[PDB]
Symmetry: D2
Subunit: 369 residues, 4 copies
């Protein structure tokens, strides 16, 4: 029986672990945290990611208790400039813990071995995984799914571009307050941009009837706009119509201002070691394909290993087949983010939705635009 | 190697033929008419039907050149009373010929044997099918997919319950005429109801950028409102905003008329004989689930034939499994037609969508409401 | 010093009394009832009537505590079909008691002699007025301003044309209830028409921040729709959006009902006798010009009495001058009532507003359309 | 017979001349231009100014061929932030030449003597007017109505604040293009403000069915925004929806960028000399009361001279009675303009409309807010 060691219990690792376990691999997953959790309040998935969940036998638990807005709306200075529905392309908004719980339960149900407080600090391409405790594990496959600061990656050395954005945002979950919001289209996704009187933006994303996901974006050199817990006045000033929710947000002390880190590698594989997710391809958040591409790539990895070839050859086949979708998506996402292209609305072009349109299960592009 | 005779080349018949063929059946399809064609109208499919198409390998041909409206809108006396998007549950509008062509080509590529000009007139519960020429064809399974006037079930004697509505409607296709329509949300499904000055309803359905599907509903007891070619005046009178399109519609010397009609049977199976589509369960078009349930039931038929039983025991287990869903859908659809409930808007409740939520491939309900 | 007896303390009577008084007439006013009061409804005045009020020195008391709606809106089956603002032509809504109180106080300040509990029963074309007590009062001018059942003209015998509508309506006042009404443009005049399920119309008229004037129209042949106190169900059924206000309206054990009624006379003058207001020209309330034409005609009466003629020659020159305007307005108003034309919206055409455009002070038409 | 010499044939002088002539003054008006014309494309008048026209016997010719928008709307970054109707307060938009022609025709009809190419260069308080030609005129009254650079004022010496604004605007008349503008509320007044991506603003004011008045405002140090003829690209960029009209505006070569000059004086009178209009009180354009206050003041001057006192004493009475309305209005207007207070909408407060509410004919405040 083939043995897999997965480093990282985020979406990438849990996806890889479940996918491999379903193919009869024996699999242990290492999470360095004392407990399995997800961070970042909310998340969008699209058709591509939802297809992975389906292939993971975890779709049902994700749809139940999540939400598809009637429309994806963009505002500039409180003026609606676009409403997009993507010609029926499936998409979904949920809390990070909602998507995460579904993945964990599915992994435990298949009998994936999960070690918490277990941190990968080095990996050898001949299939050896070194933990912080000193323990050394032999395996036929080693998946580095350990985030943007991947120690699996850096222990081996991968030529790479790695940098951090100037600005970031505060992501949080607050009650919907839908009756308090009064008249309007409050089940929509609404990207509310402003450049006057200053640069402040909210991405309003309903997760379900109870929970609203908010991304509060202001420049890092805005001492008030970037404060956590949120400086209520400067947010209520530019978003009066979101006051009830902003009030609940001011109450939260777990709130943080996060900047965005990206990584581009020349290669995602070295012998028996594969890098998936942010370890290999962290990107600007603009197209909300960060975890989708991670899940697709993780899922596609288990597929390429069902071909009868050596683990080394499958991995090279894997990357060659799957990476260009992620490359174009990261490039376009970076371009959008640095140009603030989303603020114009109607940005979800056919090209922008390429990653979203990919079906990992049948390996084709679906939902044409 | 099991052998199957399928009577009628409609959606239910083609679905049945392809599904069996994919499972290794030798299948032959008899089409009464001189060729394979559809009524020249539009049609709605939902998640349940789309999943069947995925299961038959015909999803991609369909999605290409079809449209998901941004919303499903209901009007009452030109006042918007409802916008619905079904919490993300997939759906689609397309011409009937579009759906047909995809099923036909998939049927052909797989090597189904399609006999045109060939009319089934009788079937035996021991496994025989009689054509209009009196010729007797043997097989291990006979599929009555011959529509509402099904000779195959009439030849055997099935106790039908029948029910007819006061309403009928005209289904046709015209150019989108989108500029001439001027200002509005003309990519929507708009269900335009009126009770004053008289009962007249137009279902407005965009199929793609070139073709608009119109459903013109009126009491059958209305000489003008049910007239094909269409009585241009009575329609423009109550729907002035659709004038350009209606002008192209009174130009059609031939167009499909139907009186709403719902038939429920004591059973669907007699020995080696199975009834699918309108033959088994024709319903009132309120919930746009006729072809949907047909396809689900035709596809589900080949599923139960795989579990290693006699064709007879399988057909019984089939109906026992898949039927209640069709029954509940037919009942609710007929109730809506009678009380004209769709004029109220917001009528696609969780109960109304139970059919559409059902996933035939995995045999669960998805897309919770 | 000429001397005048005016019968009836309505708008036409008060206008007449004040106008003559300002010109040096000694004037006495007889009010049948125990005191001076108005029906407890609302009322529309236009430029023509406002100019009369300016001419009587009573404009300012009126404008204070009255409202000009931002627009005059027409609905059909809850669909907005019309917004009108009359190219700036002035207009106003106010309670009837508001208009009354201003005229009364102006009448008093000028020293008009107001006799209450005093009922005119007959008048002589030689200059005599008979009270219910049989007492005969002499004067140089008698003014029949005693309303629709005018004893003063009946005593003399005027050939009337009469005409009655199938419709009547309930006029009442309730609190504005503006928060409870929620989202909308609730300072508008909204004329809410319905023909389905049955003919029911509500004229929605804000008078000021505290008081809302409602006109509930229904066929007189409708037992429920014409019932005062109001049949709460039938109204909330067709007007759910006005529920809070209607709740306060079914709380009124007494409220003004009127069947539409239009009377045209062979003439308005007999010798020294002049007829004004409903006495002379009661009309269908479609164009809200009854009190308007009354006041214009009462005010115009004192104008012709100044040009140095016999009271008899003056009264003749008066009608010859001012009457056609009232005739055209009465005809068009009656036509609108009969055909229920106001349901179509945009019905305040140039012709429909000829009355309102007329300026009594300068004797020209203003505010062209 | 009293003789008046009026310097200046703008709205102030023509108003004074007509008013005085109507009171039996003999009056000559001096206009330094070779021909009588008005400049500045369009103009707003309100109730106060319309009341003066009424008192001048020139109201009728102004209403005919002018326009009252349904509403006064304000936009910020294409988002409607206010719609104001001023509780029925009359107001009107017209071309400058429309208001001017009415005044000229009325002045000629009364027999006002009009000398063109006649420029006042000095005035003596004992009633002497010196022209550029050398001619010296004796009179009982001398009205300085000669604009912001009043030579009547400066020949005598009046302590004063006089300055020029930093920015200005381009005012022009173009065809309505109402069909080309497509869907919207294109009979409204719309003040369209923007500060991002740059400071550009259009005041959109319909004058009648044929003529639209546009004020294109950009800073003086914007080389493109301030160009005449207009730089079409930078205007179409921020106002795409006004393209058809902007195209017609680019065509005009008479277009100029004008800055705003103001004057505040300690006194408006010296002996027999009175200053009216911009000569005495030019103000920031924000409240559109520039010509209204001029007309009110001019008209009020003829009133104070019908009191039987000396011309010197009437003039002191005149200013004392009438000036504070103009003072508060100019101060508020200046405050608004420098603060760009109009951009917030809902700025036409009761206080802002004080000047507008004044009725010069009855000397009271009307149309309460
Ligand atoms: C602001 C923002 C908004 C975003 N919105 C979306 C969105 O809407 N939709 C979307 O699809 N994507 C979105 N993304 C991107 C998405 O969050 C990431 O692409 C995704 O979380 C990557 O998951 P991962 O499992 O590869 O990495 P991670 O989530 O970083 O997970 C790795 C897990 O690694 C564990 N671990 C770390 N180091 C070790 C180690 N050395 N040994 C063992 N375990 C280790 C980490 O602690 C954690 O448990 C967004 C990103 C940002 C920044
Ligand atoms: C007005 C109206 C609107 C509708 N809208 C929708 C909608 O939006 N969505 C939806 O899912 N459903 C809709 N339906 C219902 C849907 O059209 C039917 O349920 C569906 O077409 C049934 O297909 P079928 O193949 O069973 O029957 P049919 O389409 O009637 O096809 C049978 C085929 O039978 C062949 N055949 C018949 N008899 C013989 C024979 N004796 N021998 C050999 N061949 C024979 C027929 O000629 C034809 O080729 C609607 C129905 C109506 C009436
Ligand atoms: C439903 C409805 C809605 C209307 N809405 C409007 C509107 O919006 N705007 C508008 O301008 N018009 C409106 N009108 C019409 C308007 O109400 C009348 O034209 C107006 O009230 C007529 O006033 P009047 O003074 O002539 O008569 P009345 O108001 O009838 O007054 C006469 C006065 O007559 C006294 N009197 C009567 N008989 C005698 C007597 N014999 N002896 C002594 N005193 C007597 C009466 O008691 C009372 O004091 C409406 C009318 C109706 C029916
Ligand atoms: C951009 C802008 C927009 C405005 N919008 C409005 C508005 O919407 N509504 C409003 O009410 N006001 C408005 N105003 C203000 C309004 O234009 C002025 O207040 C008004 O034109 C003043 O008129 P006047 O007759 O006093 O002066 P002027 O119009 O300057 O007229 C004097 C006349 O003086 C003649 N003349 C000059 N010198 C002599 C001389 N020495 N001897 C003899 N004749 C002489 C001038 O040539 C001309 O014929 C606006 C002003 C600006 C700048
Ligand atoms: O920060 C963003 O631009 C962003 C854009 N889309 C989804 C999301 O979760 C975040
Ligand atoms: O420039 C202005 O602010 C202006 C404001 N109101 C009316 C007008 O004609 C101009």
């Amino acid at each position: 029986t083939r043995r897999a060691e997965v480093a990282g219990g985020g979406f990438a690792g849990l996806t890889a672990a479940i996918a491999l376990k379903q193919n009869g691999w024996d699999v242990r997953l290492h999470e360095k945290s004392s407990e399995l959790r997800a961070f970042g309040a909310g998340i969008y998935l699209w058709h591509n990611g939802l297809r992975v969940l389906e292939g993971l036998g975890a779709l049902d638990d994700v749809l139940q208790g999540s939400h598809t807005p009637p429309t994806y709306e963009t505002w500039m200075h409180n003026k609606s400039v676009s409403k997009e529905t993507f010609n029926g392309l499936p998409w979904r908004i949920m809390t990070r813990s909602h998507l995460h719980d579904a993945l964990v339960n599915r992994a435990r149900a298949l009998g994936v071995d999960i070690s918490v407080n277990s941190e990968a600090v080095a990996a050898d391409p001949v299939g050896r995984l070194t933990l912080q405790t000193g323990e050394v594990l032999e395996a036929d496959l080693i998946v580095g799914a350990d985030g943007v600061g991947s120690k699996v990656r850096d222990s081996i050395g991968f030529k790479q571009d790695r940098w951090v954005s100037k600005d970031g945002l505060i992501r949080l979950i607050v009650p919907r307050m839908k009756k308090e919001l009064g008249h309007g289209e409050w089940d929509n996704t609404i990207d509310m941009w402003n450049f006057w009187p200053r640069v402040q933006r909210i991405l309003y994303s309903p997760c379900n009837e109870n929970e609203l996901y908010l991304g509060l974006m202001a420049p890092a050199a805005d001492p008030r706009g970037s404060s956590v817990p949120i400086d209520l006045e400067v947010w209520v000033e530019m978003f009066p119509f979101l006051e009830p929710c902003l009030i609940e947000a001011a109450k939260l002390k777990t709130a943080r201002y996060d900047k965005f880190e990206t990584t581009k590698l020349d290669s995602w594989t070295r012998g028996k070691v594969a890098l998936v997710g942010d370890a290999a391809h962290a990107m600007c958040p603009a197209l909300a394909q960060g975890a989708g591409c991670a899940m697709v790539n993780a899922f596609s990895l288990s597929q390429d290993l069902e071909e009868g070839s050596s683990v080394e050859d499958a991995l090279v086949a894997w990357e060659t087949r799957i990476r260009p979708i992620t490359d174009r998506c990261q490039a376009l996402s970076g371009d959008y983010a640095a140009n603030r292209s989303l603020s114009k609305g109607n940005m979800f072009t056919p090209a922008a939705l390429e990653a979203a349109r990919y079906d990992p299960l049948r390996r084709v592009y679906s939902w044409p635009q």
